[PDB]
Amino acid sequence: PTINQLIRKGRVSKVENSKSPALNKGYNSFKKEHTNVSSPQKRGVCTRVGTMTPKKPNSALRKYARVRLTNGIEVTAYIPGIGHNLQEHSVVLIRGGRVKDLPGVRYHIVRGALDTAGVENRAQGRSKYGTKKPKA
Amino acid sequence: VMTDPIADMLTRIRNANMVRHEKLEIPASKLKREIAEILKREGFIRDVEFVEDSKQGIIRVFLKYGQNNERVITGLKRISKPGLRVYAKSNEVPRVLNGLGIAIISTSQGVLTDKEARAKQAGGEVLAYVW
RNA sequence: AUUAGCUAGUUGGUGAGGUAACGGCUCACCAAGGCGACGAUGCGUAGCCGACCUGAGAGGGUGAUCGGCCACACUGGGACUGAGACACGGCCCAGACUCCUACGGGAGGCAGCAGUAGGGAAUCUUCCGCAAUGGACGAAAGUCUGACGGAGCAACGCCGCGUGAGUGAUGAAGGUUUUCGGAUCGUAAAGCUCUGUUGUUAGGGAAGAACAAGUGCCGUUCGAAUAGGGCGGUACCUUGACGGUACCUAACCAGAAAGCCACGGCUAACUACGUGCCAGCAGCCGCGGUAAUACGUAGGUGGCAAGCGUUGUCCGGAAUUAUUGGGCGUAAAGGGCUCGCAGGCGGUUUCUUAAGUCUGAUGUGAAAGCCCCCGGCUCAACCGGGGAGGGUCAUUGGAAACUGGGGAACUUGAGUGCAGAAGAGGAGAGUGGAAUUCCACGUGUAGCGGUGAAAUGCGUAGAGAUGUGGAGGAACACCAGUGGCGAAGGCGACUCUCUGGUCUGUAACUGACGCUGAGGAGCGAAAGCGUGGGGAGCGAACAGGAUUAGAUACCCUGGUAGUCCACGCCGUAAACGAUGAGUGCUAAGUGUUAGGGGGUUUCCGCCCCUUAGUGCUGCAGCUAACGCAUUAAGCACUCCGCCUG
C-alpha cells in the first residue's frame, strides 16, 4: 500500500518449515541440550518393528519402522525394500523421503546401510536399495 | 485538500482523451503553465492559451487530433508522488518508450525535456511520464 | 513488544588521585539528572569485512578456504620485565582433571605440525628440505625455523585426456520380438589397415639458483695516511628438498580400462514375461482386486560420463511479502463508528536561503575475486599484466525550477458573520387515545378455548360473548414513502424546557488556518451482569397435552428470568453499501426530499438554469463473470487498518 505505511511495519516475510523436522537437530552429551546441526543423514536404532496399512485408495500393507536416532528423538521411519533385513537394535541410516500414502512417516531407511544388506536379486535400481553389481 | 497540483491536471488531460473533448480548464499555477508550453512546442497540443482572471487563473488546451481517429496523447503518468521523490541523475536520464516517448524533467537550469536535459547534462526531479 | 519501563558512579559539576593520553576512569563533595516509541532496558541468537553463491536487475542466503581486524590460549583473577602484552608453546594464585612421589612434595596444558581417543552421517600423511621465498638474532659466514617449500591420502570439486580407430552387409553368428515373412541389437563384431596420448621399456635431462660469502678492480667517502676500511659498480668463483620428477627421445601391443539413472503425463525414450489391493513404485497428478508402456525382470531405447543418481541445505522459477514488482463487493482482507496528540502529507503569487536535490574538482573505498582487454603455461582450468567498477564518503566550488526553511501578498480550500429553510437528531419533567389482560357488577347459558387432528388447560362455585366502572403497565395505528436526520449503533403518539450538527443565499471577514490520523479518549442495538424500582401483554429455562419408532424440537395451554426505569459495567454482531476517510475529474436519461435563480404569470402552474443528499435504467472505461457505472468497483493522489492456502 502507501509508502509510510510500509516503513514502520516492514514486509513481514514468509517463514517456512523444513521437509523433515528430525534431521535438523543434533545432540551433544555433556552440554545436555539439543543443538541445531542441520546434518543430512543420521544413524538410528529401531525399537518396535510392527506393520500396518496405508490410508486410502491404495490399501496394501506397509512395513512401518520405528527408529530412535542419536539426537534422542524417536521418529517412526519407513522400510522401502522388497522385504526387509532389520531386526531390533540395528544400525539404520535415514535419508529424507516423503511418503504421501502412509500417515505420519516421513523417513525412508536407506536400504544399503551399514547393517541393511541389499534386497535380494535386484538388477535395475542398483544405486538405490543397496545391491552390488551381480556379476561382470 | 487537493494533495498535489500536478496530479489532477495530468489525469484531467487523460480523462478527456476517452471522451475526446476539444478544450480543457486547468487552474494554472506557474509550473502548470510551463508544462503546457512543453507539450505545445513538441507535438501534443494544437494550441494552448492563457487566461488572466482574478480568482487564480485558468489555462486551456486545444487537444491535438491530427488524423482520423488517433489520439496523439495515449496516456500520462505522474511518477514523483508526494512521498516518493524520484531523483534520476544526469548520467541515468530515463528515456521512455525507447525511441518514441518523452519524460518531462525539472532541472535546476529550467524545467526541461529529455533532450534539453540530456545535452546540458544536468538531472534532478522527474515529474511525469508521457506516452 | 506474547520484552515498556530501565540505570545511583547511574547521570552532572567542582577539586583530588590515577592513567602514554581525554575522561566517574577511581574517590570525596555538591546537584538530580540521564536513557526511551526513531523501541531503551531485556532476551534468544551470532565473530565482522573485501567478498562467495544465486537473481535479468532490485534484492535474498552464507561469512568455509585465501586477504583485513578484533577477541581467546584447560576455566577464572592478578601482575611483573620489556618500545609494545595483562603474554598461544612465561611467571604467581585458586577450580576441575591427568601424571609422579619414599605422601613430605612436585611437574603438566595440542583450538602449533602430524597422529590418536572421543563426538558424529563425515573430513588426510606421526615424510623430506631450509634450495627458493620469509622472519629471529649476529659484523658476516652462519645458526634457527611444523612460517613456508614440496612429497603422501580421499573422484571432494572444477577443468583436461582416455577407454581404441578407419574400412567392412553377410545385414554374420548370437540375443530379443514376431501378425513366424520378418524386425531390431548394425558396420556393431569378424576380416583388413592403423598410430601409441597414456599404459610399458630404455635413454637424455630443465627453469626454479637470485645470490650471499671470499676474491678482483674503478668510483666516492672518511682517514696521520697510497695504512686500513666503508658503501657504489662490474669480474671470477660457488649454492637443489621436490627429483632423474616434470619433460623430451626411441621401442612394444587393441593390447590396461564404463558405468550408473531414466523410459504413463511433467520429460527425451517401450515392448515381452512375472504379477493380481498382495508383493511393491511414488517429487507432482496418482499407478496394481488377471491383459501394470507407472510394480519386479529381460530385451531394447534414451540421459549423462569418470561419474551418475538419491539425501540435506540455500537461492531461483515464487510477480507466492510484490520499492522496481500485488490486493481488499462476493475469492484471504476495511478497524462498528468517531474526537483527535505524536508522525504523515500541502492551495496560489513573490523575494530569499541552499538542508534535500543537481554538478564539477580533490582526497579516498588496499591487494587478490567479479568484469574490460592482452600475455603466459601443449589449450583449458589456472596464472600474469593493464584498466574499469564499487561510497545514502568527506572537503570544496558551482546550479535555483521543484521539496524543505524564512520574508511578503491573492482568495477558490476550509472557517466566521449575516439572511433563510428542512428535520422521528439527543437529554429532561409532564400529557393523553384506542387495545390487551386483571378485577367489581349488571345482563345472560353450556360450553368456550385451541389444532394437521385432538387433548391438557377454563367452566354450573356461572366461564366465553356482552354493558358500565376501576387499577396498572408497556407498545405508540392512521400519516408511512429505495421519505426525513445522525458519524455509526439508532430515533416514529403529543406539547414544553435545554442542546448538537446539517443545507441554501451571498461576500461582509480571516488569508491555507486544511485532510488523514498508530497508540490514547468517548459512543456503540439485542443478550448478559450488580443494586433497587415496576412487571399488562409477551416469554428462554422448566412443566403439561399431543406429535413421533425417539421429541430433551416445530404445534399446543400455562409459565421464571427478562424486556421496562434510574444508575454502574460488559464493548461484541451479516456493528452490511459484505464498498476505510477526504480532494478533483470523467456521456446521459430519470424520479424523488430541501432550497435558490429566471421565464409570461399575484397566481395555480408549466419550462429552464442551479447546490445538496436520495433511488432506478444506462456510454466510455474497470471487472475473472455476475455486476459497478457523477453516491464507482473509472482514471490519479495524499494519509490509517487488514490478507498471504
GROMACS .gro file of N, CA, C and O (backbone and C1' of nucleotides) in nm, chain C residues 125-172:
model
  336
  392U        P    1   4.510  -4.083   0.622
  392U      O5'    2   4.668  -4.092   0.638
  392U      C5'    3   4.741  -3.983   0.692
  392U      C4'    4   4.888  -3.993   0.660
  392U      C3'    5   4.983  -3.963   0.776
  392U      O3'    6   5.098  -4.047   0.767
  392U      C1'    7   5.028  -3.816   0.596
  393U        P    8   5.105  -4.184   0.851
  393U      O5'    9   5.168  -4.141   0.990
  393U      C5'   10   5.297  -4.083   0.997
  393U      C4'   11   5.299  -3.967   1.094
  393U      C3'   12   5.435  -3.908   1.127
  393U      O3'   13   5.482  -3.820   1.028
  393U      C1'   14   5.302  -3.931   1.324
  394C        P   15   5.626  -3.750   1.042
  394C      O5'   16   5.690  -3.767   0.897
  394C      C5'   17   5.738  -3.893   0.854
  394C      C4'   18   5.801  -3.883   0.717
  394C      C3'   19   5.908  -3.776   0.703
  394C      O3'   20   6.035  -3.820   0.748
  394C      C1'   21   5.755  -3.756   0.525
  395C        P   22   6.140  -3.713   0.807
  395C      O5'   23   6.196  -3.637   0.679
  395C      C5'   24   6.274  -3.705   0.582
  395C      C4'   25   6.288  -3.623   0.456
  395C      C3'   26   6.352  -3.486   0.472
  395C      O3'   27   6.494  -3.491   0.479
  395C      C1'   28   6.158  -3.467   0.338
  396G        P   29   6.573  -3.385   0.570
  396G      O5'   30   6.560  -3.248   0.491
  396G      C5'   31   6.622  -3.232   0.364
  396G      C4'   32   6.593  -3.096   0.306
  396G      C3'   33   6.611  -2.979   0.400
  396G      O3'   34   6.746  -2.940   0.415
  396G      C1'   35   6.406  -2.956   0.287
  397C        P   36   6.810  -2.936   0.562
  397C      O5'   37   6.733  -2.816   0.633
  397C      C5'   38   6.781  -2.683   0.623
  397C      C4'   39   6.729  -2.614   0.499
  397C      C3'   40   6.789  -2.477   0.471
  397C      O3'   41   6.792  -2.456   0.330
  397C      C1'   42   6.556  -2.457   0.496
  398A        P   43   6.921  -2.495   0.244
  398A      O5'   44   6.881  -2.454   0.096
  398A      C5'   45   6.979  -2.427  -0.003
  398A      C4'   46   6.913  -2.390  -0.133
  398A      C3'   47   6.807  -2.282  -0.123
  398A      O3'   48   6.864  -2.152  -0.131
  398A      C1'   49   6.723  -2.466  -0.246
  399A        P   50   6.800  -2.029  -0.050
  399A      O5'   51   6.678  -1.982  -0.141
  399A      C5'   52   6.698  -1.947  -0.277
  399A      C4'   53   6.568  -1.948  -0.352
  399A      C3'   54   6.465  -1.849  -0.303
  399A      O3'   55   6.482  -1.721  -0.360
  399A      C1'   56   6.365  -2.061  -0.320
  400U        P   57   6.526  -1.597  -0.269
  400U      O5'   58   6.413  -1.589  -0.159
  400U      C5'   59   6.324  -1.479  -0.157
  400U      C4'   60   6.181  -1.524  -0.151
  400U      C3'   61   6.103  -1.471  -0.033
  400U      O3'   62   6.056  -1.340  -0.053
  400U      C1'   63   6.063  -1.703  -0.057
  401G        P   64   6.116  -1.221   0.035
  401G      O5'   65   6.193  -1.299   0.151
  401G      C5'   66   6.196  -1.249   0.284
  401G      C4'   67   6.081  -1.304   0.365
  401G      C3'   68   6.095  -1.293   0.516
  401G      O3'   69   6.060  -1.165   0.564
  401G      C1'   70   6.026  -1.511   0.460
  402G        P   71   6.174  -1.057   0.591
  402G      O5'   72   6.142  -1.006   0.738
  402G      C5'   73   6.215  -1.056   0.848
  402G      C4'   74   6.132  -1.148   0.933
  402G      C3'   75   6.195  -1.186   1.065
  402G      O3'   76   6.171  -1.089   1.166
  402G      C1'   77   6.120  -1.381   0.955
  403A        P   78   6.289  -0.994   1.218
  403A      O5'   79   6.365  -1.086   1.323
  403A      C5'   80   6.299  -1.127   1.442
  403A      C4'   81   6.378  -1.233   1.514
  403A      C3'   82   6.527  -1.209   1.527
  403A      O3'   83   6.560  -1.119   1.631
  403A      C1'   84   6.487  -1.432   1.462
  404C        P   85   6.594  -0.966   1.598
  404C      O5'   86   6.750  -0.954   1.628
  404C      C5'   87   6.800  -0.969   1.760
  404C      C4'   88   6.891  -1.088   1.770
  404C      C3'   89   7.030  -1.068   1.713
  404C      O3'   90   7.118  -1.007   1.805
  404C      C1'   91   6.938  -1.272   1.633
  405G        P   92   7.181  -0.864   1.771
  405G      O5'   93   7.314  -0.899   1.691
  405G      C5'   94   7.422  -0.964   1.757
  405G      C4'   95   7.509  -1.041   1.660
  405G      C3'   96   7.560  -0.963   1.541
  405G      O3'   97   7.671  -0.881   1.572
  405G      C1'   98   7.477  -1.171   1.469
  406A        P   99   7.665  -0.724   1.538
  406A      O5'  100   7.664  -0.720   1.379
  406A      C5'  101   7.716  -0.609   1.308
  406A      C4'  102   7.806  -0.653   1.196
  406A      C3'  103   7.767  -0.783   1.127
  406A      O3'  104   7.663  -0.766   1.032
  406A      C1'  105   8.000  -0.781   1.169
  407A        P  106   7.545  -0.875   1.020
  407A      O5'  107   7.611  -0.993   0.936
  407A      C5'  108   7.629  -0.981   0.796
  407A      C4'  109   7.742  -1.067   0.746
  407A      C3'  110   7.717  -1.216   0.742
  407A      O3'  111   7.644  -1.256   0.627
  407A      C1'  112   7.927  -1.175   0.841
  408A        P  113   7.550  -1.387   0.631
  408A      O5'  114   7.652  -1.508   0.620
  408A      C5'  115   7.732  -1.526   0.504
  408A      C4'  116   7.844  -1.623   0.529
  408A      C3'  117   7.802  -1.765   0.565
  408A      O3'  118   7.775  -1.842   0.449
  408A      C1'  119   7.967  -1.690   0.717
  409G        P  120   7.721  -1.993   0.460
  409G      O5'  121   7.644  -1.996   0.599
  409G      C5'  122   7.644  -2.114   0.678
  409G      C4'  123   7.670  -2.080   0.823
  409G      C3'  124   7.561  -2.122   0.920
  409G      O3'  125   7.570  -2.258   0.957
  409G      C1'  126   7.620  -1.898   0.961
  410U        P  127   7.446  -2.357   0.930
  410U      O5'  128   7.363  -2.351   1.066
  410U      C5'  129   7.428  -2.369   1.191
  410U      C4'  130   7.360  -2.290   1.299
  410U      C3'  131   7.211  -2.312   1.311
  410U      O3'  132   7.177  -2.429   1.383
  410U      C1'  133   7.256  -2.080   1.313
  411C        P  134   7.070  -2.531   1.322
  411C      O5'  135   6.930  -2.468   1.363
  411C      C5'  136   6.902  -2.437   1.498
  411C      C4'  137   6.794  -2.333   1.509
  411C      C3'  138   6.666  -2.362   1.433
  411C      O3'  139   6.581  -2.453   1.499
  411C      C1'  140   6.732  -2.139   1.394
  412U        P  141   6.534  -2.586   1.423
  412U      O5'  142   6.461  -2.531   1.292
  412U      C5'  143   6.323  -2.554   1.271
  412U      C4'  144   6.247  -2.424   1.265
  412U      C3'  145   6.152  -2.408   1.148
  412U      O3'  146   6.027  -2.472   1.168
  412U      C1'  147   6.284  -2.214   1.169
  413G        P  148   6.003  -2.619   1.110
  413G      O5'  149   5.879  -2.603   1.013
  413G      C5'  150   5.767  -2.526   1.054
  413G      C4'  151   5.639  -2.603   1.039
  413G      C3'  152   5.533  -2.568   1.143
  413G      O3'  153   5.404  -2.577   1.083
  413G      C1'  154   5.581  -2.798   1.154
  414A        P  155   5.307  -2.449   1.084
  414A      O5'  156   5.405  -2.327   1.052
  414A      C5'  157   5.428  -2.289   0.917
  414A      C4'  158   5.438  -2.140   0.902
  414A      C3'  159   5.418  -2.088   0.761
  414A      O3'  160   5.282  -2.069   0.728
  414A      C1'  161   5.613  -1.990   0.854
  415C        P  162   5.213  -2.152   0.609
  415C      O5'  163   5.326  -2.166   0.498
  415C      C5'  164   5.354  -2.061   0.407
  415C      C4'  165   5.497  -2.070   0.359
  415C      C3'  166   5.523  -2.174   0.252
  415C      O3'  167   5.489  -2.129   0.122
  415C      C1'  168   5.687  -2.192   0.421
  416G        P  169   5.425  -2.232   0.016
  416G      O5'  170   5.546  -2.327  -0.022
  416G      C5'  171   5.655  -2.277  -0.098
  416G      C4'  172   5.772  -2.372  -0.100
  416G      C3'  173   5.747  -2.512  -0.154
  416G      O3'  174   5.754  -2.517  -0.295
  416G      C1'  175   5.874  -2.524   0.045
  417G        P  176   5.623  -2.503  -0.385
  417G      O5'  177   5.606  -2.646  -0.452
  417G      C5'  178   5.540  -2.752  -0.383
  417G      C4'  179   5.635  -2.866  -0.355
  417G      C3'  180   5.572  -3.004  -0.342
  417G      O3'  181   5.547  -3.064  -0.468
  417G      C1'  182   5.724  -2.970  -0.165
  418A        P  183   5.424  -3.167  -0.485
  418A      O5'  184   5.470  -3.298  -0.407
  418A      C5'  185   5.546  -3.398  -0.472
  418A      C4'  186   5.587  -3.506  -0.376
  418A      C3'  187   5.476  -3.596  -0.326
  418A      O3'  188   5.446  -3.702  -0.415
  418A      C1'  189   5.601  -3.519  -0.142
  419G        P  190   5.295  -3.753  -0.432
  419G      O5'  191   5.257  -3.812  -0.289
  419G      C5'  192   5.308  -3.937  -0.245
  419G      C4'  193   5.243  -3.978  -0.115
  419G      C3'  194   5.091  -3.982  -0.118
  419G      O3'  195   5.041  -4.104  -0.168
  419G      C1'  196   5.162  -3.856   0.068
  420C        P  197   4.902  -4.108  -0.249
  420C      O5'  198   4.792  -4.091  -0.136
  420C      C5'  199   4.775  -4.190  -0.037
  420C      C4'  200   4.664  -4.153   0.058
  420C      C3'  201   4.528  -4.132  -0.005
  420C      O3'  202   4.460  -4.253  -0.032
  420C      C1'  203   4.574  -3.953   0.142
  421A        P  204   4.400  -4.282  -0.178
  421A      O5'  205   4.256  -4.213  -0.175
  421A      C5'  206   4.152  -4.271  -0.098
  421A      C4'  207   4.047  -4.171  -0.058
  421A      C3'  208   3.969  -4.106  -0.171
  421A      O3'  209   3.865  -4.189  -0.221
  421A      C1'  210   4.033  -3.942  -0.013
  422A        P  211   3.873  -4.250  -0.370
  422A      O5'  212   3.810  -4.137  -0.463
  422A      C5'  213   3.892  -4.040  -0.526
  422A      C4'  214   3.811  -3.928  -0.584
  422A      C3'  215   3.671  -3.910  -0.528
  422A      O3'  216   3.668  -3.845  -0.402
  422A      C1'  217   3.667  -3.891  -0.764
  423C        P  218   3.551  -3.878  -0.298
  423C      O5'  219   3.531  -3.740  -0.221
  423C      C5'  220   3.403  -3.682  -0.208
  423C      C4'  221   3.408  -3.534  -0.234
  423C      C3'  222   3.408  -3.491  -0.379
  423C      O3'  223   3.279  -3.489  -0.437
  423C      C1'  224   3.577  -3.375  -0.262
  424G        P  225   3.260  -3.504  -0.596
  424G      O5'  226   3.298  -3.360  -0.653
  424G      C5'  227   3.218  -3.247  -0.620
  424G      C4'  228   3.286  -3.118  -0.657
  424G      C3'  229   3.331  -3.105  -0.801
  424G      O3'  230   3.225  -3.074  -0.889
  424G      C1'  231   3.504  -3.031  -0.659
  425C        P  232   3.231  -3.130  -1.040
  425C      O5'  233   3.322  -3.023  -1.115
  425C      C5'  234   3.283  -2.887  -1.119
  425C      C4'  235   3.397  -2.796  -1.156
  425C      C3'  236   3.466  -2.824  -1.288
  425C      O3'  237   3.392  -2.779  -1.400
  425C      C1'  238   3.628  -2.779  -1.122
  426C        P  239   3.365  -2.879  -1.523
  426C      O5'  240   3.501  -2.875  -1.606
  426C      C5'  241   3.540  -2.757  -1.676
  426C      C4'  242   3.689  -2.742  -1.684
  426C      C3'  243   3.762  -2.837  -1.778
  426C      O3'  244   3.751  -2.802  -1.914
  426C      C1'  245   3.879  -2.824  -1.574
  427G        P  246   3.722  -2.917  -2.022
  427G      O5'  247   3.861  -2.993  -2.035
  427G      C5'  248   3.977  -2.924  -2.077
  427G      C4'  249   4.099  -3.013  -2.073
  427G      C3'  250   4.082  -3.153  -2.129
  427G      O3'  251   4.082  -3.158  -2.270
  427G      C1'  252   4.199  -3.165  -1.925
  428C        P  253   3.987  -3.263  -2.345
  428C      O5'  254   4.065  -3.401  -2.331
  428C      C5'  255   4.197  -3.413  -2.380
  428C      C4'  256   4.259  -3.545  -2.345
  428C      C3'  257   4.178  -3.669  -2.379
  428C      O3'  258   4.184  -3.702  -2.517
  428C      C1'  259   4.276  -3.692  -2.164
  429G        P  260   4.057  -3.766  -2.590
  429G      O5'  261   4.022  -3.895  -2.504
  429G      C5'  262   4.037  -4.025  -2.558
  429G      C4'  263   4.118  -4.114  -2.467
  429G      C3'  264   4.074  -4.260  -2.462
  429G      O3'  265   4.126  -4.336  -2.569
  429G      C1'  266   4.107  -4.179  -2.242
  430U        P  267   4.026  -4.404  -2.675
  430U      O5'  268   3.970  -4.532  -2.599
  430U      C5'  269   4.057  -4.636  -2.558
  430U      C4'  270   4.008  -4.700  -2.430
  430U      C3'  271   3.880  -4.780  -2.440
  430U      O3'  272   3.901  -4.912  -2.487
  430U      C1'  273   3.870  -4.636  -2.252
  431G        P  274   3.783  -4.995  -2.557
  431G      O5'  275   3.723  -4.893  -2.663
  431G      C5'  276   3.756  -4.905  -2.801
  431G      C4'  277   3.853  -4.799  -2.844
  431G      C3'  278   3.837  -4.750  -2.987
  431G      O3'  279   3.733  -4.656  -3.002
  431G      C1'  280   4.063  -4.796  -2.947
  432A        P  281   3.633  -4.668  -3.127
  432A      O5'  282   3.719  -4.616  -3.250
  432A      C5'  283   3.780  -4.489  -3.247
  432A      C4'  284   3.877  -4.471  -3.361
  432A      C3'  285   3.823  -4.509  -3.498
  432A      O3'  286   3.739  -4.411  -3.554
  432A      C1'  287   4.037  -4.602  -3.471
  433G        P  288   3.636  -4.453  -3.669
  433G      O5'  289   3.716  -4.422  -3.803
  433G      C5'  290   3.664  -4.461  -3.928
  433G      C4'  291   3.773  -4.486  -4.028
  433G      C3'  292   3.739  -4.585  -4.138
  433G      O3'  293   3.665  -4.526  -4.244
  433G      C1'  294   3.945  -4.645  -4.043
  434U        P  295   3.511  -4.566  -4.263
  434U      O5'  296   3.515  -4.680  -4.374
  434U      C5'  297   3.608  -4.673  -4.480
  434U      C4'  298   3.668  -4.808  -4.509
  434U      C3'  299   3.568  -4.921  -4.526
  434U      O3'  300   3.512  -4.925  -4.656
  434U      C1'  301   3.743  -4.991  -4.383
  435G        P  302   3.353  -4.939  -4.673
  435G      O5'  303   3.322  -5.088  -4.627
  435G      C5'  304   3.377  -5.199  -4.696
  435G      C4'  305   3.375  -5.323  -4.611
  435G      C3'  306   3.240  -5.361  -4.554
  435G      O3'  307   3.159  -5.432  -4.646
  435G      C1'  308   3.399  -5.364  -4.381
  436A        P  309   3.016  -5.374  -4.688
  436A      O5'  310   2.948  -5.496  -4.764
  436A      C5'  311   2.954  -5.627  -4.710
  436A      C4'  312   2.817  -5.686  -4.688
  436A      C3'  313   2.704  -5.629  -4.773
  436A      O3'  314   2.613  -5.734  -4.806
  436A      C1'  315   2.650  -5.608  -4.545
  437U        P  316   2.654  -5.849  -4.911
  437U      O5'  317   2.711  -5.966  -4.819
  437U      C5'  318   2.653  -6.095  -4.820
  437U      C4'  319   2.590  -6.132  -4.688
  437U      C3'  320   2.506  -6.023  -4.620
  437U      O3'  321   2.389  -6.081  -4.564
  437U      C1'  322   2.672  -6.101  -4.471
  438G        P  323   2.245  -6.042  -4.622
  438G      O5'  324   2.144  -6.076  -4.504
  438G      C5'  325   2.101  -5.976  -4.412
  438G      C4'  326   2.206  -5.946  -4.309
  438G      C3'  327   2.153  -5.893  -4.176
  438G      O3'  328   2.243  -5.932  -4.071
  438G      C1'  329   2.290  -5.729  -4.276
  439A        P  330   2.229  -6.075  -3.999
  439A      O5'  331   2.375  -6.137  -4.011
  439A      C5'  332   2.423  -6.187  -4.135
  439A      C4'  333   2.540  -6.279  -4.115
  439A      C3'  334   2.528  -6.376  -3.999
  439A      O3'  335   2.448  -6.489  -4.028
  439A      C1'  336   2.741  -6.274  -3.995
   0.00000   0.00000   0.00000
